[PDB]
């Protein structure tokens, strides 16, 4: 018993992890087989990163300009690319510790691990989720970027978000392995303000399921609702609509405890009507939204 | 900026993780040069556990009898003794990939990494706390027993927990690598509850510079405090006390943000006694006690 906002085990993806110096500008780079991932904005200077022209600045780079460091050895880099806001630095050494890996792109409110690292060194591990406005509240210093965000499923890692910036407002944004930004951010130092972020329904019912599991049971009532009766309260609440897909992925859990989906979702309503008024659950006094349906049940079956 | 609950990067504790069967019972080993760690209560059935004399029920065990797995290769047994409540199976092989390691016995209020196990393989990695009362609040299921709690200082991973138990109140029991029980706590299935758990103080202060380092600021007021004046609402609220060491430990915290520790404990004191109105401090709706002064340094200045 007991429920842990629990990340995938690292070491596959610290294997991968390389530093890489442009210029005056280092960052973290993922090394898979023989080509080396990092932020476009490896080319930049702060100055630059203003009004960027990625194009004419990567014109101005050759090969031997990117340093790239794994441990404490130099790789040679035979080749670059730059596909959307990622470059492709292509070694003469396949990773010898490559694991077996995917590139995915993740919806909002889907959950990964970060590996958070500074010169191609990782420094900690923590579970997130992407929010509904397409931005993460991660823990990135200067130097993060390049870090990586991934799920393994076991020996597969699919690697789903690579770090580029923080916003102004101390929230974070970056681009999948293809280098495409998730939500309308921009590898531009300028006025981007993220929208609402919305809580992950979904993911709140999911942890509602766990708090059962794991003995918190003092915010079940006796009542039901409708996915409309309780869509009326989550929009009041800033809440994404729940759907009869997420009705459906929430089905092993509402087996497993005998809690009909719409039952919990009127002890939910009850929760955001009333609040917790100074109780806890799983040593929460917030609903907790950063823990998928998957993850509720990978964690309560123990699954490696 | 962003201030996560992160666990340190597991893939050296990864890399010593085997499975350790003896009879029916199937838990996690820690290897580390020729010699695997595990909870002495392998040998132990369910039944065993209500009343186990560990001494008589190693006699009926031989080396042959202990089957260690590391990935899908068998380790050959040569030798096996209790030391307190953990065996030291040796093997005729030195694990390769042992890193550099020492075994440490924390006190209560420090945190550590916990690499969650099953059947030898890691299943997840996440933060937490020596409670005061000796428990820790972790996630383990049946068959985690000998999953490991360290810290890494750059390339030394400090062991100090290994998992023996689950109390009958949902809480976790365990030893250093020497085999002692933290706390009060035997390897027997029998009444044994947990003391008061009181909050860790110069945690939840560490985690207030955190927020104040990292953008929020609303809960700074305008008063002061002296160490016993905090003290008396600290025990109303069952906060453990605050000493001069703690003040100490909590001076380069001060000095990085400017704000004296008394008057970050009459911020404190005020949110004990009016509580947070509703309000949120780096993402909790309470005040959190599993970051050490030395993990806000450690997180804020990106150390790997
Ligand atoms: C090459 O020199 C720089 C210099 C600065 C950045 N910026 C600014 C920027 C850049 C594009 C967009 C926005 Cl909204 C903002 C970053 O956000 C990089 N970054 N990532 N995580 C961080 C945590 C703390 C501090 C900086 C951090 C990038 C490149
Ligand atoms: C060899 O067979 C067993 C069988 C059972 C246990 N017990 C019972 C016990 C044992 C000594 C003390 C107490 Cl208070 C309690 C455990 O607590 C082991 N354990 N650890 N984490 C768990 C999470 C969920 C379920 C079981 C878990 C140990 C050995």
């Not at 929760?271 to 100074?278: K, S």
């Not at 950063?290 to 699954?303: L, M």
Request: glycine content about 8%; charged content about 15%.
């Amino acid at each position: 018993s007991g429920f842990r906002k629990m990340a995938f085990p690292s070491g596959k993806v610290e294997g991968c992890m390389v530093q890489v110096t442009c210029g005056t500008t280092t960052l973290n780079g993922l090394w898979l087989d023989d080509v080396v991932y990092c932020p476009r904005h490896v080319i930049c200077t702060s100055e630059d990163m203003l009004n960027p022209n990625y194009e004419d600045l990567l014109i101005r780079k050759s090969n031997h300009n990117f340093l790239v460091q794994a441990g404490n050895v130099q790789l040679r880099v035979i080749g670059h690319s730059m596909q959307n806001c990622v470059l492709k630095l292509k070694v003469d050494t396949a990773n010898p510790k490559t694991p077996k890996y995917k590139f995915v792109r993740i919806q909002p409110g889907q959950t990964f691990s970060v590996l958070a690292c500074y010169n191609g060194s990782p420094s900690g591990v923590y579970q997130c989720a992407m929010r509904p406005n397409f931005t993460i509240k991660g823990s990135f210093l200067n130097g993060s970027c390049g870090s990586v965000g991934f799920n393994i499923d076991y020996d597969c890692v699919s690697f789903c978000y690579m770090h580029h910036m923080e916003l102004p407002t101390g929230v974070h944004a970056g681009t999948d392995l293809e280098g495409n930004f998730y939500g309308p951010f921009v590898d531009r130092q300028t006025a981007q303000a993220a929208g609402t972020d919305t809580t992950i329904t979904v993911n709140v019912l999911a942890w509602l399921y766990a708090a059962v599991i794991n003995g918190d049971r003092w915010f079940l009532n006796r009542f039901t609702t409708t996915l409309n009766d309780f869509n009326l309260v989550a929009m009041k609440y800033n809440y994404e609509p729940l759907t009869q897909d997420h009705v459906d992925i929430l089905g092993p859990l509402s087996a497993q405890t005998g809690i009909a989906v719409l039952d919990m979702c009127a002890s939910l309503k009850e929760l955001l009507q009333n609040g917790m008024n100074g109780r806890t659950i799983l040593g929460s006094a917030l609903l907790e939204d950063e823990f998928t349906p998957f993850d509720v049940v990978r964690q309560c079956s123990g699954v490696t």
